[PDB]
Amino acid sequence: MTTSVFVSGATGYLAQQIIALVLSKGYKVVGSVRSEEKGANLKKLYGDDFSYEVVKVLEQKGAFDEALKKHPEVTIFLHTASPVTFEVEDTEKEILIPAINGTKYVLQSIKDVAPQITRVVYTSSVVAMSVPEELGSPDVVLSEASWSSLSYEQSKTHGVLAYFGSKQFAERAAWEFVEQEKPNFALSTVNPVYIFGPQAKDEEVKGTLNLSAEMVNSVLKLNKDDDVPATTGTFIDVRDVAKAHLAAFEKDEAKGERLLLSNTRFNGQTLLDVVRKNFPQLADKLPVGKPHSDDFSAFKEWNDKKTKKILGFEYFDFETSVVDSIKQVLK
Numbered sequence: 077m078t079t080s081v082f083v084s085g086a087t088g089y090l091a092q093q094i095i096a097l098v099l100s101k102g103y104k105v106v107g108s109v110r111s112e113e114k115g116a117n118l119k120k121l122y123g124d125d126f127s128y129e130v131v132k133v134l135e136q137k138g139a140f141d142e143a144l145k146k147h148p149e150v151t152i153f154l155h156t157a158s159p160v161t162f163e164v165e166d167t168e169k170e171i172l173i174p175a176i177n178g179t180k181y182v183l184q185s186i187k188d189v190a191p192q193i194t195r196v197v198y199t200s201s202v203v204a205m206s207v208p209e210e211l212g213s214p215d216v217v218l219s220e221a222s223w224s225s226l227s228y229e230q231s232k233t234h235g236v237l238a239y240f241g242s243k244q245f246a247e248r249a250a251w252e253f254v255e256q257e258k259p260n261f262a263l264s265t266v267n268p269v270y271i272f273g274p275q276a277k278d279e280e281v282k283g284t285l286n287l288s289a290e291m292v293n294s295v296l297k298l299n300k301d302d303d304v305p306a307t308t309g310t311f312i313d314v315r316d317v318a319k320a321h322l323a324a325f326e327k328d329e330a331k332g333e334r335l336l337l338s339n340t341r342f343n344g345q346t347l348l349d350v351v352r353k354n355f356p357q358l359a360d361k362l363p364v365g366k367p368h369s370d371d372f373s374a375f376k377e378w379n380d381k382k383t384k385k386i387l388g389f390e391y392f393d394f395e396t397s398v399v400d401s402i403k404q405v406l407k
Contacts, residue, residue: 080104080149081325082193084140084182085157086128087114089288090199090268092276093318094154099125101322106147108140108157121277135159135178144189151192152325153261155182156199159242167238172231175242176249183253186261193261195325200247200265202310202338203240211309214372219379220267220334223248254332262331264324266317269338272397273314274404281405289314289401295347296358296402304365305344310378312337313392320387329386336380339391341372350395355402 081098085091086107095105099122108131109115115128129143134157144150159174179198186193202211205222224244231241247265254263272289275281287293295305317337324330345365352359352367392400 078102078104079151080106080147081152081154082106082108082144082147082150083154083156084108084131084134086118088156089275090271090314090317091156092118092280093273093314094156094321095122095126096276097315097318097322098154099123103152104149106143106150108134108143121279135174135181137177137181138185139178140182140185141189144185148190148192150190151194153186153190153193153196154199154321154325155179155196156321158199164235164238167232167235171238171242172228172245175246179246179249180253183250183257183259187257187259191260195331196259196261196263197321197324198247198250198263198265199321200250200267200334201243202267202269202336204244204247205267205336207240208236214375217376217379218336218338220336220382222336264330264332265334266320266324267334267336268317268320269310269312270342271314271317272311272394272401273316273392274400278404278407281407285405287401287405289398291347292351292398292401293405295344295351295362298362300361300363302363304348304363308341308343310338310341311394311397312339313397316389316391319389320383323387327386333382333386335383335386336378337383338378338380340394341375342394343370345370346394347398350398351402354395354399355406 081103083091083095083105086109098105104125107118107128109128110132112130119126131139131143133139204224205218206224207226210216226241226244231237270291275288320335320337348365349367352362
């Protein structure tokens with residue numbers, strides 16, 4: 077009485093949608109944020125059931141020790157935070173190692189300081205399951221068993237491969253920790269694809285008119301002469317990813333599982349067609365392309381049947397997710 081959930085990286089896009097849902101379920105949340113001011117801001121948004129602790133360097137050894145000691149009422153840990161960066165100076169030092177080590181140290185801290193925690197959900201990614209070329213191939217079927225074959229070496233060589241590799245090796249480290257250190261908690265992971273959808277709080281749409289569904293605000297900043305963005309892949313709505321995190325710690329079936337969070341396929345045309353129909357006023361400063369020339373019928377469906385069975389709910393569709401994102405930005 078009652079149940080308190082720890083959410084790392086509480087200011088995050090997906091993190092706040094998680095927090096919103098979890099609070100709606102009557103849970104309490106203890107969020108980690110990078111500064112007192114970030115904490116105060118969430119507290120104003122979320123109310124009495126929300127509290128926070130300040131953890132500046134999440135990848136540092138023993139980083140979460142103090143915040144965990146101060147909260148023995150915490151029995152669930154949602155590890156959603158991932159390293160904030162830009163400067164591709166040394167990918168190893170600044171991306172690979174922090175992600176790996178950070179995952180180790182956070183789990184190590186839960187064992188050392190929070191033995192009452194019974195469930196840990198690690199937010200991973202589909203990039204842990206595959207390589208960029210395979211993500212766009214119609215012959216590829218990913219499942220909960222899929223692991224990226226990207227090597228450590230090649231994962232150093234570029235910003236994108238670095239982000240791919242960091243998520244792969246971090247998630248491998250998490251499972252390895254469960255195998256080796258045998259903690260009191262059951263681990264599960266959520267592995268989302270391209271995330272679309274509105275933010276949890278209107279007050280957080282800032283800077284004004286910018287979309288956290290990043291692929292969306294990329295097309296919104298188009299000129300009526302630009303090409304159609306050739307980006308493509310599968311999408312999932314942030315509220316669905318949020319609902320998967322809840323299931324990931326509430327349901328017994330989710331223990332020791334990886335949950336592939338992936339809905340339908342899209343490209344730039346798919347996005348344009350939706351934006352243009354639902355927001356006509358924006359169409360004169362947008363390109364037309366070739367409406368509905370997007371044809372994904374040859375792509376084999378990914379195997380997420382296990383995940384869908386565990387979750388037991390139906391997903392938001394592409395248009396609804398996109399329309400909700402934009403509708404909120406326009407308020």
